[PDB]
Swiss-Prot record, chain C:
Subunit note: The 26S proteasome consists of a 20S proteasome core and two 19S regulatory subunits. The 20S proteasome core is a barrel-shaped complex made of 28 subunits that are arranged in four stacked rings. The two outer rings are each formed by seven alpha subunits, and the two inner rings are formed by seven beta subunits. The proteolytic activity is exerted by three beta-subunits PSMB5, PSMB6 and PSMB7.
Expression (tissue specificity): Detected in liver (at protein level).
Function noted in UniProt: Non-catalytic component of the 20S core proteasome complex involved in the proteolytic degradation of most intracellular proteins. This complex plays numerous essential roles within the cell by associating with different regulatory particles. Associated with two 19S regulatory particles, forms the 26S proteasome and thus participates in the ATP-dependent degradation of ubiquitinated proteins.
Name of the coding gene: Psmb3
Annotated source species: Mus musculus
Entry GO MF terms: endopeptidase activity
Similarity field: Belongs to the peptidase T1B family.
Modified-residue entries (N-acetylserine), positions: 1
InterPro entries the UniProt entry points to: Ntn_hydrolases_N (IPR029055), Proteasome_beta_3 (IPR033811), Proteasome_bsu_CS (IPR016050), Proteasome_sua/b (IPR001353), Proteasome_suB-type (IPR023333)
Domain of life, source organism: Eukaryota
Protein name: Proteasome subunit beta type-3
UniProtKB/Swiss-Prot annotation, chain E:
Pfam families found in the cross-reference section: Proteasome (PF00227), Proteasome_A_N (PF10584)
N-acetylserine sites (modified residues): 1
Function: Component of the 20S core proteasome complex involved in the proteolytic degradation of most intracellular proteins. This complex plays numerous essential roles within the cell by associating with different regulatory particles. Associated with two 19S regulatory particles, forms the 26S proteasome and thus participates in the ATP-dependent degradation of ubiquitinated proteins.
Protein name: Proteasome subunit alpha type-3
Organism the protein comes from: Mus musculus
UniProtKB/Swiss-Prot annotation, chain F:
E.C. code: 3.4.25.1
GO function terms (MF aspect): threonine-type endopeptidase activity
Residues of the full protein shown: 44 to 263 of 277
Gene Ontology cellular component annotations, sorted alphabetically: cilium; cytosol; nuclear body; nucleoplasm; proteasome core complex; proteasome core complex, beta-subunit complex
Record-given protein name: Proteasome subunit beta type-7
Transmembrane segments: none
Induction: Up-regulated by the antioxidant dithiolethione (D3T) in colon (at protein level).
Keywords for the protein's UniProt record, in alphabetical order: Cytoplasm, Hydrolase, Nucleus, Protease, Proteasome, Threonine protease, Zymogen
UniProt key word Transcription regulation: no
Any coiled-coil regions, as ranges: none
Swiss-Prot record, chain G:
Phylogenetic placement of the source organism: Eukaryota, Metazoa, Chordata, Craniata, Vertebrata
Function description: Component of the 20S core proteasome complex involved in the proteolytic degradation of most intracellular proteins. This complex plays numerous essential roles within the cell by associating with different regulatory particles. Associated with two 19S regulatory particles, forms the 26S proteasome and thus participates in the ATP-dependent degradation of ubiquitinated proteins.
Assembly and interaction partners: The 26S proteasome consists of a 20S proteasome core and two 19S regulatory subunits. The 20S proteasome core is a barrel-shaped complex made of 28 subunits that are arranged in four stacked rings. The two outer rings are each formed by seven alpha subunits, and the two inner rings are formed by seven beta subunits. The proteolytic activity is exerted by three beta-subunits PSMB5, PSMB6 and PSMB7. Interacts with NOTCH3. Interacts with ZFAND1.
Molecular function via GO: lipopolysaccharide binding
Glycosylation: residue positions: 107
Glycyl lysine isopeptide (Lys-Gly) (interchain with G-Cter in ubiquitin) crosslink site(s): 112, 205
One of the Pfam families matching this protein, by short name: Proteasome_A_N
Gene that produces this protein: Psma1
Protein name in UniProt: Proteasome subunit alpha type-1
UniProt xrefs under CDD domains: proteasome_alpha_type_1
Induction: Up-regulated in liver tumor tissues. Up-regulated by the antioxidant dithiolethione (D3T) in liver, lung and colon (at the protein level).
Source species: Mus musculus
Positions where Phosphoserine occurs in the chain: 107, 174
Tissue: Detected in liver (at protein level).
């Protein structure tokens, strides 16, 4: 038989900072690098997918996960915590579709997912998520890119970096980003900014990349990755 | 149970000198159809007590499961205490009434027979919760035909032997086969004594049909 | 009949680039008329209207609870509601009460924002949406309204021609119904203007 | 609807018709009323089509988990008890007459009959459904003690053919099933394959 | 095997080396209590527990460490007797629910698995503490045969040919290994079960003890019963004779 | 309402009418009765119109949630079990009669689901008001392993039989052909009935209606 | 020091300190003696007073016609446990129409007292009881403790300075079985006298006796009712 | 830090033992049982002369035959007295009779150790009542007096004193009380002991007095009626 | 469908005096047209000063008596007192009203002695309303006994009578005569009459045979 705690584990420090969220932001910082770029024509999400032992089956578990026909997710930090956030995002997208009969807007999904992330920073006997989320989507003739951090806040981005050396990524992205980029050119800079902190030569099994446009969100096949990966397309 | 499906008819019971005897036919009638012609309606509760039930047979199997377990659970302890015939009857009175008050009753009419402390016990339980003690008991159509025959002999002789009580029941079961449409000529004889509970197998009452010729 | 207790009739019609919605104004219990000025058509977003016909309580209750969900939708999302979105919102609201429904048959009429396209639909008491390109009717004199709309309606109609069509389709159908009448209000919805007219009708 | 299960030495023989009616119209003239629960356990369905199918799937789920947990082949008595516990607890809500017949390596061929009441009893043969009421005379007269497998197949096929002949709710096609240690073998007797019995004519 | 500045206070807390100390301290409670033995023969299982008499004022047959879970299942407990009776009641209820659902008597291999899951459920949370009791289960059937199982405070169940739990379980197991219990009849086994108990028992450290033995096999037709007074005195006479 | 489904060599052909009635009066002339479940399974609907829509949308929502978690195409048996267990739980109060049909990795599977919760697996099934007329066409002209165009002709004749004979059915014939590689959703397959165009125009002249009060509100 | 706060916390030795701390509560309360013969079960209890001006505490409680108890420790925990014992006896008589056996009732106490000793936030019942009862098996004397473990005893005494009473009952244990009702009560109070110091002894104001058996139901004797039992005493040894 | 139901090495609960320490801070109350009736006396303890003396009522009636004096935390007492007043009316409704003083005291004693954290109702107690009560009334057995404490140990008393100077007042009551005294002597004696232990001098507005007798109902002594017994200083 | 109630008959009578209380009832238990048993007394003793009677549905009678017996002990444990006749009568009123919407098909008559030592008889209805009276008859033959009780005991409708107080010897004769008259006309009353006498000494029981047909 079990009971369940009713008291919050995340509390305010004498300085005025929520200590558990501060350390949750440190968990994502030590995770695998992930980048997202909006290019007006479409959104591109790329992440480091290092299997390390080669005995691992690469195609079995994916880091880039689809939520609906036009929305996808990429993360940095802990795997198990992200997987729960995928299922919750997938469920919230379906609940919206049953009521309004319209595909969920990207900004509207993020607001609902961030509310769940806020809940775990205030509810009894639970720790915050150690995951920062990258949400991409296409609606109203416009591409979207959002960031959802452990606290429950959300930011709209043109281009952003996560995981290890994210500060080095963000400084590299602002030099590399342009207005009115092409979707196929956006994949080039996304796979290049990930190579800034990688060290062990990139193969089509080493990274995972997903694109989102007017046709919808889909994960790129290893054959499509191999074409882009050999320095040039 | 709101509507009974497979039902058993009359159950007899009469106490003699040094024990009680209970009899019931092995028939489970489905409305007018006699579907199951070989089912046990009389059970052994423990070592001194026995039970015979009328009405819905599916409801009886549930009581066979509960009372069966209650005896087993008591025998696990082995503290020297056992359920008396009066205790089983008192439980059954309280259990049938409880489900009556819930508006979901067990469609049953029981005859409790037992022998403890040198005393013979015979109890009756309705589906509503009506209970009493009687020297002779009969259920269903037995209360209309077999009971008058039981009360007649007990008026002349209150204390009967094991042989006299046995042939009395066999005489009552013959009449029940003549005038009850849901009865069958295959019954079990269950008897409690100081030695224990004993139930005999298939037994048929001999019937006379000589009155079929003397119409004209 | 539960629907025939208070009476009422609601009609919607399609034109070229305009939508028209008309309803009777009678509020009465069974046979006795009570109020001449009763609102049945409710604004939902400058260029989208809903007309409710059936039980007078459920007409007002649904309109209030739909406005409750409308404003929250327009605050969470930085956009005005779509006609298809509202249709599904009414369908969801009514189906929540499946085994105890609001005795009213909603009719939505209005133009699609940003895309200027006309839209009309009608729903059941339990919330079953159906889209048409011609007309949708609800009320006690449903059969009377069908007979007028099947003969008068034309494919492409201008705001002035659509007004004359929906007005005559209501007036004549209402005059054959005992529980409906006492004036007919018409809302003609255009991209530039909303024209509201109260027609001269029989007061018996 | 007519369902039948006869027990022999090596196992059991099951038989059922294929007609399911909603009033006077036949919704399905080729219904499979012999539902498998386990490897050697089968059941016969009669009554409400929605009720019989829902309980059968529930017992398959309950016994399936039971067989793995005990790490032994399931008993026929165990499978019949799971039908008993559902038909008795919800006797006022369900309209079902299930005959459970199968084989286990402990006891062998077994036939259990669970009617609408919710009771359970083991029988040598069991008949159920609306069409069974027409063959109570035939089965009682033709049944011989100690019949072989091939004799039980003929015994079930003849009784079903006579029931489908008279009953309006019964008809269609005969579906047979034989279960033993070797496994389960099923055969279907078609329109011309049905045992013909002469029609009374002057 | 020392760290205790935290890590050992809650059962839902792991230690740096990866150990749950709350379960281990409950295993210390069963080591402090007297030895409970039970061996499996060719045609059944015989139990034997040394019951330490704390005071001569207590009646003969008080504080029973032998329980009847089912009419065919026996139970021999060791450790804290408070938790022992509660685990017996849960086992009795589990055996009761099996007969109510399926009809036949519960197999011991399934019964031991179901109760061990209940024992393990108390080793996961901070709201509840693990049982400070280890117990043995034994039954005999015509199809299943002789079976013996043991469940420890953590919730681990294993089959045994001969098992002992208590004070000197290591000293007891060395004496069981000498016995050929795979060939021996359970009637001669009772003498050997009582023998090991007397050897294991400490006279200079502990006070006077009372012997309790149990049947479950072909001789008792499958039913778990207490050893009759005729055989119990015969077993005690055999054990005291070879004490020299 | 006349809905039907058939199993041919390559896949499944599903058929439906377009008439939706309120009592004994036609409410909708063109109504979609073939419903989307998954990119490989479609389901026809009959009985209560609101109950058919909401039950379909919930199963389609659950299977999309199911297919994304598994990472592969959903099965017809999964669609069947979800509809079977839900309708049984409500004891037939949700009046939804559904003809389920789709193509799996196992093959083509067709189901007929009743509001009470009973399901039947058959090569051909008919449900609705004009199901009696539609079944008679199948019981006369159906043959195992038939061609795609031959199966399309078989269902269209079955739906038409329910259209002309049954008063509950009418207007257009909708077809849905699902195979192993191709999915054809023919919305208007056949239009056997049409309105006899009005030769007498009843167009109301501008200013024939009397107006009491007028108010104009400008918009952006 | 760090393990003696909750019942859920185990000691490295393999002990629960909170249960052991609850055992000390029984030692704080005044002594009571419980003994049985072959036909009768007698409870003799010593009463304590906060002041000479205040009346003495109730030490013997009535549970049923055949079952009675004498409590030692916490008063509120005693009455709470007594209400459970009263209800269980009433439930058996309501259903089975027979007096509930003592062996059954004591087992029910060992089931209820076990629950709080294993759950967080809950505490053990800080009261020790001596249960006297008569059934089909004869007279019974049972001992229940803060720990769910219960004892079936020939004669037992628990409370403050109960060691002196415990030694006396051991030396005369063989005499109780063939002892009659009158003398068997004298044995109970004689053990209770040994607990008290040399100067003070038994009086009509501080002695309660509860007798149950074959002849009579459970009855509690108070002030003037206890005088026939006190008159005819052996007097205190030096 | 420990729980509310924690046992000491001595063998008693901390929260109960600390509740007894809370009474030693409250005002002193003296009750005397006599064959002619039971009297109850208490000091009001007025902090400021601006406060109304009639507002402080430490003696309150439960029924027409039972009165009670309270000490310690006055706020906690008003909850216990309210429970006692309901229990007497619940017994009157069911049995058509008046409860004995012992029965009423036992009913309040049931709510003694009804406190805890886990396995309790949302509206359950967290701490014991830090109140000593003196139930004094007349029933079928005559005039009776009972004393109750936080532990729930209720006992009959001939003369009992509880409060700040309870230990000093108890020794003074032992030297005066006997079995054959009168009610007028019991009233006279209680005033002499009370004026010795009080910080301020005895006055009619300073103290509160009430008597219960077999003749007539519970009577509260008014300012004028006190003057007859106050004049005997 | 299913009826939870059944009519079992039986008539219970009680007369109060100055120092005694008589409660009497027939021993017949029947259903429809058949007799279940000939030995089933409706009068039952609760305490040394109280005897209760039950008529109507026997299933409710058996359960209610066991509820009172359980409540008698619960009062005895808490209050340390034997429950008085007036307190039991007040308690039964609340027990019968707790089952207001599912009432007991039961007619109770409590007869015993009050606090002073005088005869007291309380009459109950199926719902709980009660009053104290000198005499009351309830059951199947209640309409047969009452008019004779109104005449002989109440001294009604007669002009010049001395008004003699009730005595035990005359009241015992009055009970035996009315049940003989009830057995001749009411089919539910017969077999044997059991009389319970509540005095300051104790409880007396006497059995007198009746018409068995």
């Amino acid at each position: 038989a079990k009971r369940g705690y009713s008291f919050s584990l995340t509390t305010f420090s004498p300085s005025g900072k929520l200590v558990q969220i501060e350390y949750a932001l440190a968990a994502v910082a030590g995770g695998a690098p992930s980048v997202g770029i909006k290019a007006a024509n479409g959104v591109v999400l790329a992440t480091e997918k290092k299997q390390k032992s080669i005995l691992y089956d690469e195609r079995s578990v994916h880091k880039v996960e689809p939520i609906t026909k036009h929305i996808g997710l990429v993360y940095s930090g802990m795997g198990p915590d992200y997987r729960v956030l995928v299922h919750r995002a997938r469920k919230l997208a379906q609940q919206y579709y049953l009521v309004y009969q319209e595909p969920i807007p990207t900004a509207q999904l993020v607001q609902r997912v961030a509310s769940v992330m806020q809940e775990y920073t205030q509810s009894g006997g639970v720790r915050p998520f150690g995951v920062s989320l990258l949400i991409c989507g296409w609606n109203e003739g416009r591409p979207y890119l959002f960031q959802s951090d452990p606290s429950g806040a959300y930011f709209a981005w043109k281009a952003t970096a996560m995981g290890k050396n994210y500060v080095n990524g963000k400084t590299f992205l602002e030099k590399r980003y342009n207005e009115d980029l092409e979707l196929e050119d956006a994949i080039h800079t996304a796979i290049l900014t990930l190579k800034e902190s990688f060290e062990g030569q990139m193969t089509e099994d080493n990274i995972e990349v997903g694109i989102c446009n007017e046709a919808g969100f889909r994960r790129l096949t290893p054959t499509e990755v191999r074409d882009y990966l050999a320095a040039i397309a | 149970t709101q509507n009974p499906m497979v039902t058993g008819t009359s159950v007899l019971g009469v106490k003699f000198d040094g024990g009680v005897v209970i009899a019931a036919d092995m028939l489970g009638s489905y409305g007018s159809l006699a579907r199951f012609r070989n089912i046990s309606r009389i059970m052994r509760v423990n070592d001194s007590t026995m039970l015979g039930a009328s009405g819905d047979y599916a409801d009886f199997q549930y009581l066979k499961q509960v009372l069966g377990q209650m005896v087993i659970d008591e025998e696990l302890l082995g503290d020297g205490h056992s359920y008396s015939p009066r205790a089983i009857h008192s439980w059954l009175t309280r259990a049938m009434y409880s489900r009556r008050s819930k508006m979901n009753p067990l469609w049953n009419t029981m005859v409790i027979g037992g022998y403890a402390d040198g005393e013979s016990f015979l109890g009756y339980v309705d589906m509503l919760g009506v209970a009493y003690e009687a020297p002779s008991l009969a259920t269903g159509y037995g209360a209309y035909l077999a009971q008058p025959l039981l009360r007649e002999v007990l008026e002349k002789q209150p204390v009967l032997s094991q042989t006299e009580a046995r042939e009395l029941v066999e005489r009552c079961m013959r009449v029940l086969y003549y005038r009850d449409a849901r009865s069958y000529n295959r019954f079990q004889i269950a008897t409690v004594t100081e030695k224990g509970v004993e139930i005999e197998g298939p037994l048929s009452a001999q019937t006379n049909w000589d009155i079929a010729h003397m119409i004209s | 009949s539960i629907m025939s207790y208070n009476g009422g009739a609601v009609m919607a019609m399609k034109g070229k680039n305009c939508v028209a919605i008309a309803a009777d104004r009678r509020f009465g219990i069974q046979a006795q008329m009570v109020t001449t000025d009763f609102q049945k058509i409710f604004p939902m977003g400058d260029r989208l209207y809903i007309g409710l016909a059936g039980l007078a309580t459920d007409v007002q209750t649904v309109a209030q609870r739909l406005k409750f969900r409308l404003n929250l939708y327009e605050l969470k999302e930085g956009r005005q509601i779509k006609p298809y979105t509202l249709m599904s919102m009414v369908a969801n609201l009514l189906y929540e009460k499946r085994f105890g429904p609001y005795y009213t048959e909603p009719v939505i009429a209005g133009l699609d924002p940003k895309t200027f396209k006309p839209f009309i639909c009608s729903l059941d008491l339990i919330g079953c949406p159906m889209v048409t390109d011609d007309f949708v009717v609800s009320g006690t004199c449903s059969e009377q309204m069908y007979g007028m709309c099947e003969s008068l309606w034309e494919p492409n109609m201008d705001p002035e021609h659509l007004f004359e069509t929906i007005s005559q389709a209501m007036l004549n159908a209402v005059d054959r119904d005992a529980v409906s009448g006492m004036g007919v209000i018409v809302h003609v919805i255009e991209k530039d203007k909303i024209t509201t007219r109260t027609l001269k009708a029989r007061m018996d | 609807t007519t369902i039948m299960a006869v027990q022999f030495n090596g196992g059991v023989v099951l038989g059922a018709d294929s007609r399911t009616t909603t009033g006077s119209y036949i919704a399905n003239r080729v219904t499979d009323k012999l539902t498998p629960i386990h490897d050697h356990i089968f059941c016969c369905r009669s009554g409400s089509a929605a009720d019989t199918q829902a309980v059968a799937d529930a017992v398959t789920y309950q016994l399936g988990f039971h067989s793995i947990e005990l790490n032994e082949p399931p008993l026929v008595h165990t499978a019949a008890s799971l039908f008993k516990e559902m038909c008795y607890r919800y006797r006022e809500d369900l309209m079902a007459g299930i005959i459970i017949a199968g084989w286990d390596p402990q006891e062998g061929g077994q036939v259990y009959s669970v009617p609408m009441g919710g009771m359970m009893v083991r029988q040598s043969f069991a008949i159920g459904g609306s069409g069974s009421s027409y063959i109570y005379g035939y089965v009682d007269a033709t049944y011989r003690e100690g019949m072989t497998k091939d004799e039980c197949l003929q015994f079930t096929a003849n009784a079903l053919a006579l029931a489908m002949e008279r009953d309006g709710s019964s008809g269609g096609v005969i579906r047979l099933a034989a279960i033993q240690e070797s496994g389960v073998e099923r055969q279907v007797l078609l329109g011309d394959q049905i045992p013909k019995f002469t029609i009374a004519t002057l | 095997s020392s760290i205790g500045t935290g890590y050992d206070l809650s059962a839902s807390t792991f230690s740096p080396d990866g150990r749950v100390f709350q379960v281990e301290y409950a295993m210390k409670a069963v080591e402090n209590s007297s030895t409970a033995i039970g061996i499996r023969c060719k045609d059944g299982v015989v139990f034997g527990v040394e019951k330490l008499v704390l005071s001569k004022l207590y009646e003969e047959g008080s504080n029973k460490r032998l329980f009847n879970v089912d009419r065919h299942v026996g139970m021999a407990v060791a450790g804290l007797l408070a938790d022992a009776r509660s685990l017996a009641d849960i086992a009795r209820e589990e055996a009761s629910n099996f007969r109510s659902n399926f009809g036949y008597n519960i197999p011991l291999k399934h019964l031991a698995d179901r109760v061990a899951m209940y024992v393990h459920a108390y080793t996961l949370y901070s709201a509840v503490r693990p049982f400070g009791c280890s117990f043995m289960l034994g039954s005999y059937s015509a199809n299943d045969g002789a079976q013996l199982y043991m469940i420890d405070p953590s919730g681990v169940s294993y089959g045994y040919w001969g098992c002992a739990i208590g004070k000197a379980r290591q000293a007891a197991k060395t004496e069981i290994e000498k016995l050929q219990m795979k060939e021996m009849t359970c009637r001669d086994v009772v003498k050997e079960v009582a023998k090991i108990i007397y050897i294991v028992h400490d006279e200079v450290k502990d006070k006077a003890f009372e012997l309790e033995l149990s049947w479950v096999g072909e001789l008792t037709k499958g039913r778990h019963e207490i050893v009759p007074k005729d055989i119990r005195e015969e077993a005690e006479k055999y054990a005291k004779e070879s004490l020299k | 309402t006349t809905i039907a489904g058939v199993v041919y060599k390559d896949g499944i052909v599903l058929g439906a009418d377009t008439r939706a009635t309120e009592g004994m009066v036609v409410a909708d002339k063109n109504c979609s009765k073939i419903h989307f479940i998954s990119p490989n399974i479609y389901c026809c609907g009959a009985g209560t119109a609101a109950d058919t829509d909401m039950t379909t949308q919930l199963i389609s929502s659950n299977l999309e949630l199911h297919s994304l978690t598994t990472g592969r195409l959903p099965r017809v048996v999964t669609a069947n079990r979800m509809l079977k267990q839900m309708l049984f739980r409500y004891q037939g109060y949700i009046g939804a009669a559904l003809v389920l049909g789709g193509v799996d990795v196992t093959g083509p599977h067709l189901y007929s689901i009743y509001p009470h919760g009973s399901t039947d697996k058959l090569p051909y099934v008919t449900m609705g008001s004009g199901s009696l007329a539609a079944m008679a066409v199948f019981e006369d002209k159906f043959r195992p392993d038939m061609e795609e165009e031959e199966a399309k002709k078989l269902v269209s004749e079955a739906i038409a039989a329910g259209i002309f004979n049954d008063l509950g059915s009418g207007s257009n014939i909708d077809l849905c052909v699902i195979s192993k590689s191709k999915l054809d959703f023919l919305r208007p397959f056949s239009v056997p009935n049409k309105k006899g165009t009005r030769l007498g125009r009843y167009r109301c002249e501008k200013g024939t209606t009397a107006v009491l009060t007028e108010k104009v509100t400008p918009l952006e | 020091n760090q393990y003696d706060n909750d019942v859920t916390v185990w000691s490295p030795q393999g002990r629960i300190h909170q249960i052991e701390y609850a055992m000390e509560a029984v030692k704080q309360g005044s002594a009571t003696v419980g003994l049985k013969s072959k036909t009768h079960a007698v409870l003799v209890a010593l009463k304590r007073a906060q002041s000479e001006l205040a009346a003495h505490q109730k030490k013997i409680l009535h549970v049923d016609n055949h079952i009675g108890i004498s409590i030692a420790g916490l008063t509120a925990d005693a009455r709470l446990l007594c209400n459970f014992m009263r209800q269980e006896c009433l439930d058996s008589r309501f259903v089975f129409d027979r007096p509930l056996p003592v062996s059954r009732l004591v087992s029910l106490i060992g089931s209820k007292t076990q629950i709080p000793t294993q759950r967080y936030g809950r505490r053990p019942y800080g009261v020790g009881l001596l249960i006297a009862g008569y059934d089909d098996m004869g007279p019974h004397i049972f001992q229940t403790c803060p720990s769910a473990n219960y004892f079936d005893c020939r004669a037992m005494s628990i409370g403050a300075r109960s060691q002196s009473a415990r030694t006396y009952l051991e030396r005369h244990m063989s005499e109780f079985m063939e002892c009659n009702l009158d003398e068997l009560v004298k044995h109970g109070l004689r053990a209770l006298r040994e607990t008290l110091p040399a100067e003070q002894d038994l009086t009509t104001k501080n002695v309660s006796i509860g007798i149950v058996g074959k002849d009579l139901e459970f009855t509690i004797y108070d002030d003037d009712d206890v005088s026939p039992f006190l008159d005819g005493l052996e007097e205190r040894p030096q | 830090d420990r729980g509310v139901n924690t046992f000491s090495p001595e063998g008693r609960l901390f929260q109960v033992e600390y509740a007894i320490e809370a009474i030693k801070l409250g005002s002193t109350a003296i009750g005397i049982q006599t064959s002619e009736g039971v009297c109850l006396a208490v000091e009001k303890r007025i902090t400021s002369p601006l406060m109304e003396p009639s507002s402080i009522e430490k003696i309150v009636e439960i029924d027409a035959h039972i009165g009670c004096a309270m000490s310690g935390l006055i706020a906690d007492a008003k909850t216990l007295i309210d429970k006692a007043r309901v229990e007497t009316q619940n017994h009157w409704f069911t049995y058509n009779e008046t409860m004995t003083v012992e029965s009423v005291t036992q009913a309040v004693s049931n709510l003694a150790l009804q406190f805890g954290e886990e396995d309790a109702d949302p509206g359950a107690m967290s701490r014991p009542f830090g109140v000593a009560l003196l139930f004094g009334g007349v029933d079928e057995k005559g005039p009776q007096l009972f004393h109750m404490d936080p532990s729930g140990t209720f006992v009959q008393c001939d003369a009992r004193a509880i409060g700040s100077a309870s230990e000093g007042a108890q020794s003074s009551l032992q030297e005066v009380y006997h079995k054959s005294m009168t009610l007028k002597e019991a009233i006279k004696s209680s005033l002499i002991i009370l004026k010795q232990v009080m910080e301020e001098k005895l006055n009619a507005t300073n103290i509160e007095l009430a008597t219960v007798q077999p003749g007539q109902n519970f009577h509260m002594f008014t300012k004028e009626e006190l003057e007859e017994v106050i004049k005997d200083i | 469908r299913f009826s939870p109630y059944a009519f079992n008959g039986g008539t219970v009578l009680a007369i109060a005096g100055e120092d005694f209380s008589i409660v009497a009832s027939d021993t017949r238990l029947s259903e429809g047209f058949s007799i279940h048993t000939r030995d089933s007394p409706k009068c039952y003793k609760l305490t040394d000063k109280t005897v209760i009677g039950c008529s109507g549905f026997h299933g409710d009678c058996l359960t209610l008596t066991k509820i009172i017996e359980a409540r008698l002990k619960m009062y005895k444990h808490s209050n340390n007192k034997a429950m008085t006749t007036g307190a039991i009568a007040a308690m039964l009123s609340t027990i019968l009203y707790s089952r207001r919407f599912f009432p007991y098909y039961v007619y109770n008559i409590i007869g015993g002695l009050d606090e002073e030592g005088k005869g007291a008889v309380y009459s109950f209805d199926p719902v709980g309303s009660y009053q104290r009276d000198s005499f009351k008859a309830g059951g199947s033959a209640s309409a047969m006994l009452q008019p004779l009780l109104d005449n002989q005991v109440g001294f009604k409708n007669m002009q010049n009578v001395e008004h003699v107080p009730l005595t035990l010897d005359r009241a015992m004769r009055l009970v035996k005569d009315v049940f003989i008259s009830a057995a001749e006309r009411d089919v539910y009353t017969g077999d044997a009459l059991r009389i319970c006498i509540v005095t300051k000494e104790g409880i007396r029981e006497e059995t007198v045979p009746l018409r068995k047909d």
